[PDB]
Amino acid sequence: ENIYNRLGEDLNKWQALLVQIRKARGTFDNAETKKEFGPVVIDYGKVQS
């Protein structure tokens, strides 16, 4: 409801935020489960599903 009130009657209703939410899907929804970066590896395995 906070989101609804903040973006009450945007371009149509939001018409922008939903677009970046699709872009916000990055670093997520990918076959990769653990982000490697050199000797530091972070595994988003438990949180993935």
Binding site: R25, D29, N30, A31
Partner: peptide, 23 residues
């Protein structure tokens, strides 16, 4: 011989099924 092998060294072809944006 290759045909009956299909049914001669043969490479193993692989492909996967995945889902993205719930597709």
């Amino acid at each position: 011989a290759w045909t009956q092998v299909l049914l001669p060294k043969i490479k193993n072809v692989v492909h996967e099924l995945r889902i993205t944006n719930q597709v």
